[PDB]
Design a binder for this molecule. Sequence first.
Ligand SMILES: OCCN1C[C@H](O)[C@@H](O)[C@H](O)[C@H]1CO
Length: 664
Amino acid sequence: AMIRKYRYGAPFDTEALTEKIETAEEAFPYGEISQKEGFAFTYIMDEDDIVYGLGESNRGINKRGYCYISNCTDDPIHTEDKRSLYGAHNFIIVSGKTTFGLFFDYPSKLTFDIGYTRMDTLKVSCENADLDIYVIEGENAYDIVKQFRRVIGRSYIPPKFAFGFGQSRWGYTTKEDFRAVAKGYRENHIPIDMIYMDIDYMQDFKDFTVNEKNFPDFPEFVKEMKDQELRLIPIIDAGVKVEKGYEVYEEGVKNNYFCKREDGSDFVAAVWPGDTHFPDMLNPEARKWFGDKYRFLIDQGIEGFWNDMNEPAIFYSSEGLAEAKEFAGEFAKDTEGKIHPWAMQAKMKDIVNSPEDYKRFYHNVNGKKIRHDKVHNLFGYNMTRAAGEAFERIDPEKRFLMFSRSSYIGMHRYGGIWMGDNKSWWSHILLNLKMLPSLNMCGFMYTGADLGGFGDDTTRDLLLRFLALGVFTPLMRDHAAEGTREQECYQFENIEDFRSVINARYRLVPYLYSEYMKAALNDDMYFKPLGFVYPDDKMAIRVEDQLMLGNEIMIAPVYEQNARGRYVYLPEEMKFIKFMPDGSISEEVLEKGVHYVDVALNEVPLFIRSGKCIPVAEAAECVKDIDTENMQLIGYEGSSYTLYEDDGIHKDYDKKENYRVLTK
Ligand SMILES: OCCN1C[C@H](O)[C@@H](O)[C@H](O)[C@H]1CO
């Protein structure tokens, strides 16, 4: 009703929305539209306007002052200059005197020039005028986000164990590796629920295999781990290894389930297994086939998966590599200095994630051929869709843990996302924080970043501050790249500080799970910018390093090295709470306004809003062992809290039995 859909040309059906909106037949209601050069929408912003949205994208909560390109890309260096990361989340909200939301339902490269060229000018452009643009009206940004959340369908809901702590590393390969992790945590009584299995668990990186040498009785290992409340979470990649006798490959070739070149052959992309084919994720029969392969792991006791490299990432194509070797032979023969090393270096970089390669393969959509670049940002989304749909077919009532690196709006119904390859940088604590509300606006609630940083070398104090933010993010996972300084919690001196921080997570799990469930079930946000909760407070609307969570608390993590506290702005009176390393809970009332709060490395801070309280459990070492029967309430006298809790396993969300009222 307050949502209208403006159709240009003949757009591709992304299935991002679950709700049907009729095509509007009036002139576009904001700014101006031009087709002189592909498609461009231009809008002149007021100087006080804030722009929210874009889900997983670079920089801040207010998107003004830079350029953002929705073009799912495998880029491990998230510096401020980058215009594209892994996600394509084409929803923005202009917020000010004039307020409206826009969703550009377009599956290809889409450029958001948000004051980059001229500060007052918002320009959104793409190559082809074949798209739907949804215009959402409302009193404020928050109401517009809520309408949007309604029409894109309910967010993915994880199983409760996924709210525990998880540990992973690109490098764990053998039973011994995994047992050392289990032992490193359990014998030091650091809580944990999950261990991630990265690409080395497979036989030569073949999807839907297990290295039968390292795991000759894999279901028995899965049980050994699960008996200790440790759930193994295996990676699945986009590329299917080319290899004779490998059933997944053979089936794919025989039934034409792979993406093909223009000449009809199966396109070759080299990734971890060397030569691979990509399953045609936009083909329904291929998707059913590919998703059903997950049963191979599910039958073995596996309850969760993560999907990687699904941009899809390409190290090189056969075509790219041939050009590379040819160039290199010229370089090698050059004696006159006609070919500089720089040109040689550039060619080598050019064959990776090449825009040319994305034009070299096609999807078969219900019989019709579509060049991949035209639908590039739909790939990772449909790979995760394939898995989610398969889960429904095998056990309609069971929640599986599922999250994906690349995504597009619509995928939020089928899995979460992690924020990809960050770095052990202090700036990435803050980057992690700012991405949270924007993802929430776009449907992606189950999210998190690699705690401690994926690439480069972490330090003890950096890992502790990351963990203290991760305490509040639904996906809380310590994961590192190969070759990095080891960053399992037991690798550092005074490990009692890591126990204290992760203890805080487990004490908060019933509250955090409850808020997640209440928000997901009501198409609402888990994390919100302060401006959404205090929209009449000009100071509050511009705060970017604090977030509101549910309706009870605010978080404000320390993200500066050597800092012993940080500044905060409280838009109302709050109780400043700290989980202390001795197990106690420090509390102090603070009035509305500016404060510097002391927060030590081994203290986890939060703020409880006036007239609110939250339940806190005693610390336990796995989700199953959390005692929720008579939790302590922290916060304001005379307040109450409605706890959501179900069995954490099935999908019986609609019971009054799931809710109970607690009173301080
Ligand atoms: O080329 C790298 C592929 N992968 C990228 C993922 O983002 C990361 O989490 C993972 O550890 C890594 C190895 O599986």
